[PDB]
Every structure is written in structure tokens, then in C-alpha cells.
Design a protein around this nucleic acid. Structure first.
Lengths: 262, 151, 206, 100
RNA sequence: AAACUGCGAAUGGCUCAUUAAAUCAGUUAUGGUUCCUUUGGUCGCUCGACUUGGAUAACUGUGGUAAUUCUAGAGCUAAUACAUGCCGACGGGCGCUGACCCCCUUCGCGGGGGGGAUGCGUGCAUUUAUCAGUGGUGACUCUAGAUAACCUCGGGCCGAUCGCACGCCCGGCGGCGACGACCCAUUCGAACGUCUGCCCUAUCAACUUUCGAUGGUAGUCGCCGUGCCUACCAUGGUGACCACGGGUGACGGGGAAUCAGGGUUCGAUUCCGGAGAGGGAGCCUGAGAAACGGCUACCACAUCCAAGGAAGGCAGCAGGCGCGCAAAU
């Protein structure tokens, strides 16, 4: 390869893009943006598979540049725009908004939210920088460079930004006893409380997260998103509240639903 | 003992020609020494603090950083200057015949003159660096003596 | 077609390696600058990323430093006297990094009388004729004379630097690569540098 | 003032060859006798030299000084202006207009 | 329509010739560097024109060669093409030089403390030299700060660009966009390195070594580290735990067949990475190419011709010949 790739095969797509095999050779390669290729979700994939508003690749384009869809308060006219974690998407005419949260399994889930919760967005700070004339800077996980932050924002905190002004309203400090969830790996979408944080000099610093029912698991430092201060979550959690039901309880719940439905 | 070759040897962090009030005695002619903590729980020795050798590839007094892997080995030969060769003996497993084989892969690491109490057979540990030569990639962090040598 | 690969040559064990792919474009090399002296010529070449590197072919002046009291002035290149790498590169007037040259002593001298108000150079038998510095000495107040007196209470330097100042040339070193940025910066040689490189010149020229 | 020309085999002459024959040379963007198909695309062509001799097909001449004997082939009617200037400063320069 | 400008052609597709620690696989690092586009920030921080210049297209007219996606002289004309460039912000701030002025026990002298006109430099991007130690790492010669300068004529930025909807307040003054731009992070990556793992062969037992082999010093070049390459030094480095040399009907892996348990054979072949476009060699443009549906010379082979010259590389899709036991519109 003499340059960057511009195509992407269907079976080379990530599994959480949640496609089929016998439809086409290629898959939608997203345009470059705030999020990585294997951690985002194209707008065409959502509008054509999840919401079922469109069936072909031209109907998605018509809806997309018809100026009907707004992305974090800004209208976007790219059908392969990368949408990732807590990307607030809004439809102005039928009055629906969706928040992208990983569910109990390894995928995205549709989650309708009220507009009052659609005005803000929780996002994770990545690194702290100092500008030219002594301006402190923040680099956010969706590449939002924010000037003049609060002095108590550290490396692995979570800030809440209003989508109309771009400023910080409130923040959550990285500490034990806070509600957390994991973004990537074998664990995905489980909601838990940070207990331990093991420090290894020169490598990945693993942590330990306990679920609300008695389960525990260990993830890396980069696989951390802090969502709450204590037990109350700052956003509306999806169905099941991220408990990671095992296969026996899942089978029992499906059998109970089948017996009750008839 | 120093300044052997056709160019001056210096540490490009400090200034060695500060103008004092007098330029006589009682406060001069003790040059500062540049050193840093390499991290990873390792402690810098006194020979890198009060020494007079000049290097550019020393992990303590130099321009090289320590990151990546931490290995170990046994010193085999000290023939070429300012760098040594160590031997790593490891066991390889075969799935068919459920029995091991020992293998050795000797490779060259860098020895600063800070560790000059080194004989053949001493156990050393090394840390990964940027390529300092064609085949040299590692810097010795500490030295451990072998059995015997009580003198 | 000059390459910079690490597969034209033998391995660590001494056995030859067989090349499998030809010369690439990131693997590139260019001929040497051979930065001479004379009227200034500088060429630009486009490199990877679309950036430009200034190839200094000839140059006249340089921005050197004199660190005993931290002054920097633009100074003309006079002559190269020593190179630690090649003994042919002094016979051809070439400029490299960490090279040993002579530069003119006029602007540092003017800074020395204009700051410390002591005569520098001006050998005995010929005094200050064009009558400019004692004009600056006069029409001052008592506070300003007290400030100069407290400043020139300590006005001593090395005797070898003084002898270079009567000689009119200061032995200088280059700390910049002229084939990459296009300029010839650096600092003047002082202290043990002067005695070491003067020993080297007197050993080579003997 | 003689300028340009075509060879008997049909090769136009490049200005500055300083040869009475045919020399092959490389041509690039911004040179005569070459219209590039790709950007930066250089191809070697064969041109006629500058010095005129008997082995030529045509020759292009211009008129620099008008005499008194008008030729019906050359000076018969004055053509009208196909299209004039477009920029505002060119109109103000041609009509010698002021600021107001 | 045409044509100038800008962007893409470096993606995709086909093949397995080379290649046996080389490629590749898992695991690390760039604290050792470039990055088109998108996303976010910066874009009156610098103290010094109510819009400038001439050239070319397309077009018109006139020609040569047997011949090409071949082209010269003549007459106009545009830019988000090529260039040259101002006003405002902008009245005073920050540092050196400072004529000088004012207050006092100390009589003045000597000392202590405040105003300072004038003159020079000012920020970001590059380079050198010195000093101190807002924020961070396991760890900087890290970022930020200060001083003195530099700032390439083939030259860093600080908008001489375009459209829609209408306008309030006495000619000034406004809303949403499109394009372009130094720097910074991000996205797509690429590239160089760390640890481990490849088929057979001793009728290959020693190999490399001023034609760099091993390391040190200082440089050149390269986007960066590094014998990558120069000048000088010491004789180093690998090897019976199989180096080296040869062969391969060898691209590597995810995988396929058979299979009680262990294994044996294959993997040219749809997804990943690598290599090439007859085979070596060199290069323009471009962010990214040693590109071949880009260019330049060599040999093998080969097309047209008025014999002067001109034009090419189906291991792309169909198709044809040869080769064949063997493979389609």
C-alpha cells in the first residue's frame, strides 16, 4: 500500500457494527473524525439498521443532506460521520433524541431520551496541556479542545458540557466510590463502582470494579468512563441498568417471557 | 585520564564557564554533575554522582531514556570498549515431544564506566533503549556479583 | 539514487542477507552540502511532509554567543582553522557542526565599551582618537556614575580572551547544522575550550 | 522580425537551440512545443534548431514597421473589436476616467 | 458544451517470480519523527485601500508533416491562476539608554527615596547562547517563563475571495454560510526498533574482516536513533545449543483434509500483511509513488512508414496463440 486505505470489506468490519454477510462486498468506512474506526458507528449504519428510517444507500443520503439531523448541536451532511460514546443525536421535526450507551452486551443500543437531558453531554478528559501564553488546555476523548478549565480537573476525570456554549458546568472526580462503566474489551456496558486501582510503573494500571449485585471484574486504566458520583447516575441508563446477566439467568428470563407471552 | 580524543567531552545541560566574582579559589573548580532518576524502582549509584567520566549513552548521565522491556542475563565477554555481551539462557517447549530444550541468544548491551566492578559471570539487568549502535539496544541498570569472589 | 537502507550489508553473525524489495522513497539520501564561504547562496529542497530545508552553500556572517556576560551579536565569518573529523576539511574552506573557526572581534568590543566602560583592544602607542566614548563618559549624574562604578567593580576576564581581543579575532565554535536550517550559529570558545583547541592547533601546525 | 517555423518533416523550432539541425531534448510544464497531459509530466521531443537553412517547409513573419505601399492581401480592411476589457481598472485605464 | 483553476488517480483489481529470523504472527515503544481530509482551539495579542499590476486559456484567423490524445508564429480577454501590497486596531503598556527634576536628620559634600521627555527592541513559526523552577510523567536536554540576538530574496502566518435572506439606528453599523491559512491536539495511518516462534541438508565445520565485519569519538545526509555514510582509533562479532554455505515442486498467517488418544499432509486461492507489473537502474509532480492504464536510457521481443521518423508493455475485465492431463461470455 502506497497510501491510506479508502475501502473496507464487510467481513473486515468490527463485530459491534452488527452487520450481515450476504448483502455486499464492502462496508461503510467512516470519514475521519473525533473517534477511532473500530470504536465508532456510521450514521448510515444507524439510520439503515437501527431506526429503520431508510432502506438503501441513497435514501440515507437524501435524509442526511436534507438538513434534518443535528449532531451535538451542529448539523452534519456526511453519511459516514463517526458517532461514538454519548454522541447526542437529535431529530428536530419529530422531536426525538437518542443517547448512545453500550448495553449489557458488546454493542450499541437505541435509547430515547428527553430533550432536557439532550442539552448536555458527559465526556472524558484525556490529557492536560499548557498553551502559548500560559493557557491551560484540556484534550477530551472526542477531541474537544477547551480553553481555561477548572483547576481541579485531573487526568482521568469526567466533565459535563452544555452543547450550546461549550463550557464546563459540573465535573466528577476520579476516586473510589464512584459509578463507572467500561468502554472496550471483554467487559463492555457493565455499570459498577471503582474499589481498587493498582499502580504498575511503566505499564498499564489495572483497576477493580464491583457490580451492584456482587460481581467483580478488572479492566485497564484506558478502559474507564466515570459516569456517576456514588450510586445515582448522572445520565439515564438503558434497560437492565448494565448488570451482565449470565447465560442461565438469560435463558430463564427468555423462557419466562415466552411463557407469559403465549 | 579524561579528554582522550580530538574533540572536547562535555555534558550539554550545565554551563561549565560561569563567571564568579573572584575566579580564584574557595568555591570554584568543583564542576556540577548532571544526573537523573531513571525510574522503575531503580536507584542511581554514587559513582554516577561523584564520577568524572563523560558519556552520551549512559542511562544516568546521558541523553538516553528507559522504556519498554526489562531483561536479565549473564556477562560472557568484556573485549570491546564501553559495551559488553550478555547471555540469556531460556527453555523452549515442543508440543509433539512433551519435553523442553534450552536455548541461548547472546546479544550486546551497553556498559557505562559507572559499573567498572564487573567480572565474567556477573548477573546484570538491562532496559530497552533507542538504537545506540548497529546491534546495541539495551542499557545496564544494575550489576550483581556471582558466587565466590569474596576479595 | 543514494540510499540509506540497512539491508545492503551483512548481519550480526557475518552472513549476507538477500534483498527482497528495491529502494523506496522514504529511504532517500542526498549529496553533501559542502558549505563554503563567500557571498550568501541558499537553496531550498522539498522534503517529506511538504516542508523545506535550507541548504546553505555559501555564507558571510553568523549569530554567535559570548557567554561570559551573555551577549549575542551578528558576526562575520573570517577563516576556518580546525576540524575534528577530517584533516582535508580545513584545506577546503568547509563549515560543519562543532567546527572551529575565527570570527571578528568588533561588535563584542563595542558592546564591552558601551556596557562596562573599560577599553578593550586599543594596544599601547595608539589611544582613542575619533572622540566618541569620552563623550558618552561625560554629561552624567552622580547616580549613573555610581551604577557604572558598582558594575565595573568586577570587570575581569580570561587573559587568552584579552590576547585574542588585541589580535582582533576570537576563536569560535559552530553549534548549528548549516545544511539543515541554512544558518551558521554557535558560541565563542572560552575557558578550557580555548587551551584545548589551541593545544590542538599548535600540535597540528607544528 | 522572423519568429517560429516548421521543418520539412514537420517539426517546430524551439527558441534557443543554437543548432541548424535537429536535437532531441526534454520538455516540461511552461515550455514551448509541449502541452502536458498529467501534472509534472515530462516527455522528450525532437525539435528544429534555431538557425534557418534551406531545409524548411514554412516560415512565419511579422510586420514591425508599416511602409507606404499597402498590400491588398495584408492591409485591406480593419477588423472590428471582438471583445473589450473586462476588469474595472482596465476600463478606467482605457477610457482615462477619474475617481468620480 | 468548451477551457482555465482546484481535487482524485498512491484507492480498487490480478498474480506468487523474489524472499528461510528476511516476510509474517502475538506482545511492546516513538520520552527517537512526518501525517491529505474531518473534528475542536487559535485566526484587532505584533507599535510599524469605496480594491493594485501584466500574461495566458476558451475564441477568431492562418499553416507544416504520410502519420499520434502531435503543435508555432498573429489579434483580444478573466480568477479562490501568477504576483505586489495598505488603513485600522493604536492609547498607551514591558524591558535597556536616559538628558534631568523634586524630599531629608546628616551644613553642603557622602547616602536613602519617587517622577521621568527623547532614542532602541517588542507576539506567534526557525536557530544559537544563558538563568530560575504553571502543569505532568516511573523517569527529560518536556511544556510554560525571563534575558541577548537571528529570522534565509529559491523569503512563515497575521483573509485585495464567493453566494442567500433582509435590514435597524445618524455615510457609518448588523444574521447564517462557502473557500483559504501559520501553529496545536485529534482521526486515517505509514515508517524504524524490542521479546519469542520458521522445511531439508555435514558428500557445507568454521564464517566475516582497511570493497564495514564489531564497538568508541566527531560530523554529512535523512522526517527522526543508527557504520546509513565519511576521517581517526581497538581487534573485535557468530559458531556443535548447527553459525556459515546450498536446495526448496517456499509468499507468511487466520485456516483445510484425515483423525480414539498423540499426530501426518496441504495452505497459488475471496479476510489480514508483504512483493512485482519483461528485468535491472534513475526521476518529476504530490501529504502520500522509486507509481509503470506517469516519465527517462539498456538489452530481449515487437507495430506503422514516402525510410526522414513516430509509437508500446492485459501477472485488470472479455478474448487469442503457445504450453499443456488440466480450467468459461
Amino acid at each position: 500500500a502506497r497510501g491510506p486505505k479508502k475501502h473496507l470489506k464487510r467481513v473486515a468490519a468490527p463485530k459491534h457494527w452488527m452487520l450481515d454477510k450476504l448483502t455486499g462486498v464492502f462496508a461503510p468506512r467512516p470519514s475521519t473524525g473525533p473517534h477511532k474506526l473500530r470504536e465508532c458507528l456510521p450514521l448510515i449504519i444507524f439510520l439503515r439498521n437501527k431506526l429503520k428510517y431508510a432502506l438503501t444507500g441513497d435514501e440515507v443520503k437524501k435524509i442526511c443532506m436534507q438538513r434534518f439531523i443535528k449532531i451535538d448541536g451542529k448539523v452534519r451532511a456526511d453519511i459516514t460521520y463517526p458517532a461514538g460514546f454519548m454522541d447526542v443525536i437529535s431529530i428536530d421535526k419529530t422531536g426525538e433524541n437518542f443517547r448512545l450507551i453500550y448495553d449489557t452486551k458488546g454493542r450499541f443500543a437505541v435509547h430515547r431520551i428527553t430533550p432536557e437531558e439532550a442539552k448536555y453531554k458527559l465526556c472524558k478528559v484525556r490529557k492536560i496541556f499548557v498553551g502559548t501564553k500560559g493557557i491551560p488546555h484540556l484534550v477530551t476523548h472526542d477531541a474537544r479542545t477547551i480553553r481555561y478549565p477548572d483547576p481541579l480537573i485531573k487526568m482521568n476525570d469526567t466533565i459535563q458540557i452544555d452543547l450550546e456554549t461549550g463550557k464546563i458546568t459540573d465535573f466528577i472526580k476520579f476516586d473510589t466510590g464512584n459509578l463507572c462503566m467500561v468502554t472496550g474489551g471483554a467487559n463492555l456496558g457493565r455499570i459498577g463502582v471503582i474499589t481498587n486501582r493498582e499502580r504498575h510503573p511503566g505499564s498499564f494500571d489495572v483497576v477493580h470494579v464491583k457490580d451492584a449485585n456482587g460481581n467483580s471484574f478488572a479492566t485497564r486504566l484506558s478502559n474507564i468512563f466515570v459516569i456517576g458520583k456514588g450510586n445515582k447516575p448522572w445520565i439515564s441508563l438503558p434497560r437492565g441498568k448494565g448488570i451482565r446477566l449470565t447465560i442461565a439467568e438469560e435463558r430463564d428470563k427468555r423462557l419466562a417471557a415466552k411463557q407469559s407471552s403465549g | 585520564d579524561i579528554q582522550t580524543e580530538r574533540a572536547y567531552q562535555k555534558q550539554p545541560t550545565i554551563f561549565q564557564n560561569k563567571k564568579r566574582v573572584l575566579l580564584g579559589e574557595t568555591g570554584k573548580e568543583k564542576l556540577p554533575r548532571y544526573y537523573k532518576n531513571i525510574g522503575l524502582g531503580f536507584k542511581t549509584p554514587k559513582e554516577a554522582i561523584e564520577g568524572t567520566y563523560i558519556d552520551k549513552k549512559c542511562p544516568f548521565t546521558g541523553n538516553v531514556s528507559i522504556r519498554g522491556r526489562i531483561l536479565s542475563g549473564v556477562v560472557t565477554k568484556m573485549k570491546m570498549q564501553r559495551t559488553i555481551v550478555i547471555r540469556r539462557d531460556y527453555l523452549h517447549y515442543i508440543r509433539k515431544y512433551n519435553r523442553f530444550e534450552k536455548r541461548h541468544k547472546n546479544m550486546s548491551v551497553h556498559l557505562s564506566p559507572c559499573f567498572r566492578d564487573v567480572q565474567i559471570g556477573d548477573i546484570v539487568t538491562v532496559g530497552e533503549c533507542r538504537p545506540l549502535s548497529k546491534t546495541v539496544r539495551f542499557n545496564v541498570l544494575k550489576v550483581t556479583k556471582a558466587a565466590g569472589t569474596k576479595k | 539514487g543514494i540510499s540509506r537502507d540497512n539491508w545492503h550489508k551483512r548481519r550480526k553473525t557475518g552472513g549476507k542477507r538477500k534483498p527482497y524489495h528495491k529502494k523506496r522513497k522514504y529511504e532517500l539520501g542526498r549529496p553533501a552540502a559542502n558549505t563554503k564561504i563567500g557571498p550568501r547562496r541558499i537553496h531550498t529542497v522539498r522534503v517529506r511532509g511538504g516542508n523545506k530545508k535550507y541548504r546553505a552553500l555559501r555564507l558571510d556572517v553568523g549569530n554567535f554567543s559570548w557567554g561570559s556576560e551573555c551577549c549575542t551579536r551578528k558576526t562575520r565569518i573570517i577563516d576556518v582553522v580546525y576540524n575534528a573529523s577530517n584533516n582535508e576539511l580545513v584545506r577546503t574552506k568547509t563549515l560543519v557542526k562543532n567546527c572551529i573557526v575565527l570570527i571578528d572581534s568588533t561588535p563584542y568590543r563595542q558592546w564591552y565599551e558601551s556596557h562596562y566602560a573599560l577599553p578593550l583592544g586599543r594596544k599601547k602607542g595608539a589611544k582613542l582618537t575619533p572622540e566618541e566614548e569620552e563623550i558618552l563618559n561625560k554629561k552624567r549624574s552622580k547616580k549613573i556614575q555610581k551604577k557604572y562604578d558598582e558594575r565595573k567593580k568586577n570587570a575581569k576576564i580570561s587573559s587568552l580572551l584579552e590576547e585574542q581581543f588585541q589580535q582582533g579575532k576570537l576563536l569560535a565554535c559552530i553549534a548549528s547544522r548549516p545544511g539543515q536550517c541554512g544558518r551558521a550559529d554557535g558560541y565563542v570558545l572560552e575557558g578550557k575550550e580555548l587551551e584545548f583547541y589551541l593545544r590542538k592547533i599548535k600540535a597540528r601546525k607544528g | 522580425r522572423i519568429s517560429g517555423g516548421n521543418d520539412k518533416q514537420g517539426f517546430p523550432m524551439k527558441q534557443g537551440v543554437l543548432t541548424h539541425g535537429r536535437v532531441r531534448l526534454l520538455l516540461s510544464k511552461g515550455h514551448s512545443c509541449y502541452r502536458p497531459r498529467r501534472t509534472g509530466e515530462r516527455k522528450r521531443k525532437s525539435v528544429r534548431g534555431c538557425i534557418v537553412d534551406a531545409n524548411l517547409s514554412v516560415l512565419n513573419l511579422v510586420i514591425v514597421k508599416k511602409g507606404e505601399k499597402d498590400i491588398p492581401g495584408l492591409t485591406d480592411t480593419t477588423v472590428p473589436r471582438r471583445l473589450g476589457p473586462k476588469r474595472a481598472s482596465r476600463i478606467r485605464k482605457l477610457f482615462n476616467l477619474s475617481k468620480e
